[PDB]
Amino acid sequence: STFSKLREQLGPVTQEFWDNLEKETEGLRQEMSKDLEEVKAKVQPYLDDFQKKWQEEMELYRQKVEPLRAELQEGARQKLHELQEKLSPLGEEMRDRARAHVDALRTHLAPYSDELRQRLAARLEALKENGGARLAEYHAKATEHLSTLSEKAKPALEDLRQGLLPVLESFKVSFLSALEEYTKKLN
Amino acid sequence: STFSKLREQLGPVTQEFWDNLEKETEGLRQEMSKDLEEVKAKVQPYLDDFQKKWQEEMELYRQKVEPLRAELQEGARQKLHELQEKLSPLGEEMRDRARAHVDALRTHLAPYSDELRQRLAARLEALKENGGARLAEYHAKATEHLSTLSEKAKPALEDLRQGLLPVLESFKVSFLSALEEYTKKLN
């Protein structure tokens, strides 16, 4: 820890010198920034004046384009106003002719779908009846085939635990003693 | 592994039974689906003709509004040119004014860019002339701060490593003794 105290003392001495040296450059930069600040203020009205010119020039165009822009708004409006009405009758007509078809389709397929679904429902029943007969038997064999191994798993695993512990206990104690010695060297 | 083999032995016995059983139901499902197809194939024409009946109308409708939409199409083709041509003279005029303004603008920023190069060089030469002496001092001090910063880094680690090897090597052997002692039980 002695080395820490050394650097902690050597640093301050040189640090003060560094601060002083940097402080000189600080003022040097301030002078240069001051000159730059001056230049910014000097050319300020110059750019401002030119801006005011373009501002008015652009605005003058906005005034001239106003009426023309409004006319083109009308000329375009009077176009679709004629087109909309022209394509309205056939548009609504075709819509209805489609809607009625959908209704007819649904109603026409209804009777066919009923008989078909009922026929299938009855057919599926015949399958479930036969399947469920053998399904119960296979399920019974399942549990018998699974409980067999698990019964001989617990006692076996426990027997192994009691066999590893004896030597393990010795290792744990040996580790504890070594662990303490490790910390002593580190700290 | 003995009990594990037991569970595997009765596997095919139980599996083949269910496998063959499901095959029996498969034959039934086969006919169920085969006989059901007789219904599906009959419903096909009912829907096929109905959908085509409407398609015939759609095909006629499209051709009906075909020339009609063309009237509105051509009519909306000349109006586009008219609208654009009307807004052209004003836009083209503003383009000339823009050209004149941009040229004046570039003539104003030109001297500023040239003068800035001189101003930058002057500031560089001044700051550089001063910074040189500063950097030289910092380097000298930094070198001295570096020597006492990592001169005892090696010896400190050497002793830390030396007073550890014996204990470490002893633990390795101890751990190795337990290693094979547990494999016997595990295997």
Ligand SMILES: CCCCCCCC/C=C\CCCCCCCC(=O)OC[C@H](COP(=O)(O)OC[C@H](N)C(=O)O)OC(=O)CCCCCCC/C=C\CCCCCCCC
């Ligand atoms: C260069 C770009 C422009 C400058 C950028 C840095 C600006 C300053 C900011 C950090 C600098 C590093 C700062 C490191 C921590 C310094 C900590 C320190 O010194 O504390 C003691 C005093 C006072 O500190 P504080 O100002 O933090 O006061 C704390 C106090 N609780 C309070 O608020 O009242 O120090 C002082 O008054 C002035 C000390 C001057 C030391 C020499 C000067 C140190 C300043 C900068 C250099 C630091 C590194 C030096 C070594 C590497 C470069 C050579």
Ligand SMILES: CCCCCCCC/C=C\CCCCCCCC(=O)OC[C@H](COP(=O)(O)OC[C@H](N)C(=O)O)OC(=O)CCCCCCC/C=C\CCCCCCCC
């Ligand atoms: C238990 C469920 C979870 C574990 C499932 C493990 C399935 C097997 C997977 C790895 C084990 C084998 C890992 C490789 C072992 C070494 C390879 C070996 O055994 O070869 C013998 C034969 C044939 O060869 P392989 O099957 O290995 O295939 C070619 C071989 N690798 C080669 O390159 O030649 O394979 C065998 O006899 C199979 C041996 C294992 C039998 C089953 C051993 C199963 C595990 C334990 C059984 C004994 C303990 C039972 C009681 C406790 C149960 C938890």
Ligand SMILES: CCCCCCCC/C=C\CCCCCCCC(=O)OC[C@H](COP(=O)(O)OCC[N+](C)(C)C)OC(=O)CC
């Ligand atoms: C109400 C105030 C509205 C103020 C204007 C708002 C909208 C401003 C948007 C664009 C302004 C007009 C176009 C400005 C240039 C756009 C980019 C462009 O086309 O450059 C090119 C364009 C055309 O230039 P030229 O015809 O010379 O041919 C290309 C250039 N060279 C290869 C010949 C060198 O420049 C101009 O026409 C002059 C302005």
Ligand SMILES: CCCCCCCC/C=C\CCCCCCCC(=O)OC[C@H](COP(=O)(O)OCC[N+](C)(C)C)OC(=O)CC
């Ligand atoms: C591919 C698209 C190409 C389009 C090219 C440009 C077409 C320009 C045509 C029209 C410009 C937009 C006009 C928007 C206003 C239409 C007003 C109008 O329709 O009056 C006729 C009627 C009722 O209009 P209202 O004024 O009562 O309601 C809408 C307007 N307000 C009230 C919300 C202000 O509406 C219709 O009959 C619908 C067809």
Ligand SMILES: CCCCCCCC/C=C\CCCCCCCC(=O)OC[C@H](COP(=O)(O)OCC[N+](C)(C)C)OC(=O)CC
């Ligand atoms: C292949 C031929 C058919 C092609 C597709 C045609 C689809 C229909 C075309 C045009 C009509 C669109 C609106 C249909 C409304 C009635 C059917 C429907 O969707 O009810 C569901 C929903 C609401 O329908 P409403 O009639 O209550 O509301 C719209 C009409 N009113 C109320 C504003 C007057 O639909 C919509 O909200 C609009 C999509």
Ligand SMILES: CCCCCCCC/C=C\CCCCCCCC(=O)OC[C@H](COP(=O)(O)OCC[N+](C)(C)C)OC(=O)CC
């Ligand atoms: C491996 C093939 C799988 C597909 C084919 C067999 C599909 C049916 C599943 C197993 C077949 C045997 C069924 C045996 C009667 C089951 C009766 C039943 O509804 O139990 C329903 C029950 C629902 O879950 P819970 O946790 O509420 O009940 C657990 C059982 N105790 C506690 C309610 C008794 O789940 C079971 O009971 C376990 C199967």
Ligand SMILES: CCCCCCCC/C=C\CCCCCCCC(=O)OC[C@H](COP(=O)(O)OCC[N+](C)(C)C)OC(=O)CC
């Ligand atoms: C290779 C031949 C043996 C194949 C065995 C697997 C295939 C079995 C075939 C058909 C049956 C499949 C569905 C039933 C599977 C489980 C059958 C069985 O023994 O359940 C046995 C047992 C039932 O438990 P509980 O009914 O009291 O329910 C408890 C609560 N929970 C789980 C329902 C939420 O659960 C176990 O033992 C867990 C392993």
Ligand SMILES: CCCCCCCC/C=C\CCCCCCCC(=O)OC[C@H](COP(=O)(O)OCC[N+](C)(C)C)OC(=O)CC
């Ligand atoms: C290698 C693992 C194989 C797992 C599948 C085959 C073995 C399990 C299937 C059948 C075994 C049948 C004989 C079981 C004998 C032991 C029974 C036993 O001690 O149950 C012990 C305990 C009983 O708990 P409960 O009676 O309160 O049940 C509550 C509902 N649950 C949680 C069971 C869903 O359950 C457990 O500890 C684990 C869930």
Ligand SMILES: CCCCCCCC/C=C\CCCCCCCC(=O)OC[C@H](COP(=O)(O)OCC[N+](C)(C)C)OC(=O)CC
């Ligand atoms: C309500 C749900 C109904 C689901 C039905 C699923 C299919 C089985 C159900 C009914 C069967 C009805 C009679 C079908 C006769 C064959 C129709 C057909 O063009 O098959 C076309 C094609 C081959 O069918 P196949 O295997 O019968 O013929 C094999 C030899 N050839 C014909 C390929 C030279 O399809 C396939 O290859 C994929 C399997």
Ligand SMILES: CCCCCCCC/C=C\CCCCCCCC(=O)OC[C@H](COP(=O)(O)OCC[N+](C)(C)C)OC(=O)CC
């Ligand atoms: C969207 C446009 C305006 C509305 C148009 C009518 C829409 C009607 C909507 C629903 C009505 C039922 C439509 C059913 C379509 C499928 C019918 C069907 O099973 O085809 C089945 C068919 C099977 O394959 P292939 O075509 O090689 O058949 C060869 C043997 N056959 C069928 C000629 C004897 O595959 C197709 O036909 C392609 C679609």
Ligand SMILES: CCCCCCCC/C=C\CCCCCCCC(=O)OC[C@H](COP(=O)(O)OCC[N+](C)(C)C)OC(=O)CC
């Ligand atoms: C808005 C929904 C209206 C529904 C009711 C009416 C449905 C029928 C209306 C139109 C159906 C298609 C008619 C196609 C024949 C006329 C096409 C035609 O105008 O040729 C004349 C002219 C040029 O035709 P192009 O083939 O050169 O097309 C333009 C070039 N590219 C894009 C094709 C590369 O048209 C145009 O310049 C406008 C694009």
Ligand SMILES: CCCCCCCC/C=C\CCCCCCCC(=O)OC[C@H](COP(=O)(O)OCC[N+](C)(C)C)OC(=O)CC
């Ligand atoms: C209120 C009316 C305006 C708004 C509604 C417009 C509705 C029609 C919309 C699009 C189709 C009509 C576009 C305007 C009429 C075009 C007539 C025409 O020249 O057809 C043919 C024309 C051929 O063009 P090119 O490929 O030979 O190119 C020539 C050089 N430029 C023009 C590319 C510089 O097609 C076009 O130029 C592009 C569309």
Ligand SMILES: CCCCCCCC/C=C\CCCCCCCC(=O)OC[C@H](COP(=O)(O)OCC[N+](C)(C)C)OC(=O)CC
């Ligand atoms: C008042 C402005 C806002 C309202 C405007 C409404 C009327 C115009 C409507 C839409 C305007 C869309 C943007 C148009 C931008 C200019 C389009 C145009 O003609 O470019 C035309 C052209 C494009 O570039 P190129 O490479 O093809 O040059 C061709 C000529 N040189 C260069 C080969 C000699 O550039 C010029 O001709 C410069 C004069």
Ligand SMILES: CCCCCCCC/C=C\CCCCCCCC(=O)OC[C@H](COP(=O)(O)OCC[N+](C)(C)C)OC(=O)CC
């Ligand atoms: C707050 C810190 C800001 C730092 C600058 C940020 C970016 C400023 C944005 C744009 C300024 C970019 C300036 C550098 C690129 C343009 C340089 C340039 O003008 O080339 C055009 C011209 C000559 O430049 P050269 O690079 O060919 O010559 C350099 C000197 N030697 C090598 C020829 C001896 O410029 C001048 O003659 C001076 C007015």
Ligand SMILES: CCCCCCCC/C=C\CCCCCCCC(=O)OC[C@H](COP(=O)(O)OCC[N+](C)(C)C)OC(=O)CC
């Ligand atoms: C106390 C509760 C448990 C505490 C944690 C476990 C304590 C130690 C107990 C068991 C862990 C070690 C079990 C295995 C001990 C023997 C390990 C052994 O003989 O390695 C032997 C060998 C070692 O590595 P080699 O580089 O010499 O490889 C030789 C084989 N090949 C690579 C040349 C093909 O590796 C093998 O032979 C195959 C993997």
